[PDB]
Design a protein around this nucleic acid. Structure first.
Ligand code: MG
Ligand code: MG
Length: 727
RNA sequence: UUACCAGCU
């Protein structure tokens, strides 16, 4: 159940083993007979009685945890001492000491209280400070240091995972952002925080119907206005008598004039200046992240309340992150038509791809170019450069059919497109003056669904003379050759008569929560051509037909049927992993089996997760740095047949590994032959020459899902299923 | 869309 083929590397991970003083805590169950009545009463009486008997604890309704046995193991109190004056029969019953399963929740509560002791606020699911900000003053911004803490049971033991996060908050006030707007979707996700009390509330509604003159209830129903209360409490005022307000449901009202938005808005997401200004702060190298880790753990063991609480619960934690032994997979041989290039440590061959011929090239006897009269010169020079650069890379290209669209609007483009495309024509390229998503969507709708024509769209800006021409032509020629059903490079995959399948779902709130599911399955021994389908429903029953159709395509192409079927599942949360095993695997097992006669394929189902809080650093001596791409971590953190792989190379900052969780293995593949396989599949992406994060079938499936949900909104035509039209 | 990684009120 463990990999075995790879040279070991020294690595480390942001984890803290917690000492095993677990057995001490004893559990008491509480019982209340006559009134019951909720917590206010439960807290009061339990407080008094159990405090005389003992101190500390957690009591969530019925269960109660205390480190020591109560002075009486069974104790009965008979007085509610409430306003009514009735009686309550308190029944304390000691049960075992603590279950192995139940310790995790207890230490979770304890550590969240510990972190609250340090003055750190809890925003989102994260713990951020509010008195030590890194500040970028250009665009009214800064960063708040943050710690992403979680106590969970991993195979190594009861482990606290720590991770340094940063949360952008704007010095500008919500009133100024509203003035800029003069946006229901944007604010609801953001957790807007108040400035006067430095308290944080997730926002739900943005209501301008209400007015500040309306006064909220307080002091037993007395109506007091917001401005008077804020002046009395926090010593500030609201300048605007009439203003929009924000609503959060626990009736909580937030005033924009004192509210500063956290997070970065969609306009800020698009604006490149904001991203590049933030990146130097938010993106942290590995050495500074290690230094922040050791500063945090030094801070935790020095403050008074935190130091006392840990010894009160009798747990002492290590003083440094965990060290471990990952293994580096050998670099793989990337195979071009007439030469082979072994990728460097950076795992990039973008320069080399320019100078070598593609494996199999669809000779461009004819292709078309649409353009506007303004960019006619741009189109001509681009076509000339493209014709110049193609013969070096093996493709053979002829001069196009050039059509000048009457107007830049998409409708004229469509009117030309219907007449232009023919069964003979292999591809159409399009010139665009402005980058607008609707025009791209209409073009891709015609090209993918309504008519079977692969196509490429180019906005004018990237082709505005200078040295843009060579780079853009060389990075568009390969994309065109990939869209024409031709392969650029290859790697040697030992697996024979295997059909790797990649499933990833793109949750789109806009399109009625359709949960667009991708489905990409190889149809070649060399894993260079693919069959693409997409399943959508309001997945359960469309995956059936997608899988049967893919099996039929493989049978049509290879005159056989596969013995192995490897399924990589993405887009599923950590909680819902068991749901997939319960409901999806048996359905697949029966569904392809029933069609045909006595056909039983193996179905290896592996779940892939990108968003994780685990970090793997490397060292050689004392300095902490990023590990080279291609390192596996399979032991001491992995639980029940999983592993971690680093495959991406980052120019600035640290690497985020990828989690792989084998939820159902019946294929007979070794864990090592699956690890190496999913590493080799990482180089199979034809848009980026080099490695990526997620395996190539899953990345293709994610792009297919994104294209179908964001742009096409329907099923791409079955004619283009064989071609990677979505690249 | 040239292309990869981010009590409060
Ligand atoms: Mg994911
Ligand atoms: Mg593309």
């Amino acid at each position: 159940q463990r990999g075995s083929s790879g040279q070991p590397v020294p690595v480390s991970a942001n984890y803290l083993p917690l000492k095993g003083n677990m057995d001490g805590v004893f559990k008491y169950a509480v019982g209340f007979n006559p009134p019951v009545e909720d917590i206010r009463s439960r807290s009061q009486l339990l407080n008094e009685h159990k405090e005389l008997i003992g101190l500390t604890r957690v009591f969530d309704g019925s269960t109660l945890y205390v480190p020591k046995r109560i002075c009486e193991q069974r104790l009965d109190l008979m007085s509610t001492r409430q306003t009514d004056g009735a009686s309550i029969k308190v029944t304390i019953s000691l049960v075992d000491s603590v279950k192995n399963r139940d310790v995790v929740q207890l230490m979770n509560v304890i550590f969240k209280r510990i972190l609250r002791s340090l003055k750190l606020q809890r925003i989102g699911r994260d713990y951020y400070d509010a008195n030590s900000p890194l500040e970028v003053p250009q665009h009214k911004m800064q960063l708040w240091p943050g710690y992403v803490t979680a106590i969970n049971r991993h195979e190594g033991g009861l482990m606290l995972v720590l991770d340094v996060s940063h949360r952008v908050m704007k010095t500008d006030t919500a009133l100024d952002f509203l003035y800029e707007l003069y946006a229901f979707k944007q604010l609801v996700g953001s957790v807007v925080l108040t400035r006067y009390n430095n308290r944080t509330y997730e926002i739900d509604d943005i209501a301008w119907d209400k007015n500040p003159r309306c006064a909220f209830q307080d002091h037993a129903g007395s109506q007091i206005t917001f401005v008077d209360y804020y002046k009395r409490a926090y010593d500030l005022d609201i300048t605007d008598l009439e203003q929009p307000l924000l609503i959060h449901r626990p009736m909580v009202c937030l005033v924009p004039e004192l509210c500063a938005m956290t997070g970065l808005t969609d306009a800020a997401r698009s604006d490149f200046k904001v991203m590049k200004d933030l990146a130097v702060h938010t993106r942290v190298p590995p050495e500074k992240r290690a230094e922040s880790f050791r500063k945090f753990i030094q801070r935790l063991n020095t403050t008074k309340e935190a130091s006392e609480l840990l010894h009160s619960w009798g747990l002492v934690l290590d003083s440094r992150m965990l060290d471990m032994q990952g293994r580096r997979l050998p670099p793989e041989k990337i195979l071009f038509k007439h030469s082979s290039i072994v990728a460097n440590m950076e795992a990039d061959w973008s320069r080399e791809c320019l100078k070598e011929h593609v494996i199999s090239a669809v000779s461009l006897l004819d292709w078309a170019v649409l353009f506007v009269r303004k960019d006619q010169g741009k189109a001509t020079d681009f076509v000339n450069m493209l014709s110049k650069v193609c013969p070096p890379i093996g493709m053979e290209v002829h001069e196009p059919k050039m059509v000048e669209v009457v107007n830049d609007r998409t409708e004229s483009y469509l009117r030309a497109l219907r007449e232009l495309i023919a069964p003979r024509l292999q591809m159409v390229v399009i010139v665009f003056p402005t980058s607008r998503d609707d025009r791209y969507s209409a073009v891709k709708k015609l090209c993918c669904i309504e008519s079977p024509i692969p196509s490429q769209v180019l906005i004018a800006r990237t082709i505005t003379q200078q040295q843009k021409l060579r780079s853009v032509a060389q990075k568009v020629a390969l994309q065109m050759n990939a869209k024409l059903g031709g392969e650029l490079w290859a790697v040697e995959i030992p697996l024979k008569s295997c059909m790797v399948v990649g499933i990833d779902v793109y949750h789109d709130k806009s399109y009625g929560n359709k949960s667009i599911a991708g489905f990409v399955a190889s149809t070649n021994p060399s894993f260079t051509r693919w069959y693409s389908r997409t399943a959508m429903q309001e997945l359960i029953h469309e995956l059936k037909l997608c899988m049967q159709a893919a099996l039929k395509k493989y049978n049509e192409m290879n005159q056989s049927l596969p013995e192995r079927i490897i399924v990589f599942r993405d887009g599923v949360g950590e909680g819902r992993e068991e749901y997939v095993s319960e409901f999806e695997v048996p359905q697949f097992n029966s569904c392809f089996s029933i069609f045909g006669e006595n056909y039983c394929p193996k179905l290896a189902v592996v779940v892939v997760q990108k968003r994780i809080t685990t970090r793997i650093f490397g060292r050689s001596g004392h300095s902490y740095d990023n590990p080279p791409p291609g390192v596996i971590v399979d032991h001491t953190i992995t639980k029940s047949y999983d592993f971690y792989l680093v495959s991406q190379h980052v120019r600035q900052g640290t690497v985020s590994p990828t989690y792989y969780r084998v939820i159902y293995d019946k294929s007979g593949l070794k864990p090592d032959h699956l690890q190496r396989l999913t590493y080799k599949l990482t180089h199979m992406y034809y848009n980026w020459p080099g490695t990526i994060r997620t395996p190539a079938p899953c990345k293709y499936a994610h792009k297919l899902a994104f294209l179908v949900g964001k742009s096409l909104h329907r099923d791409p035509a079955h004619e283009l299923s064989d071609r990677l039209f979505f690249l």
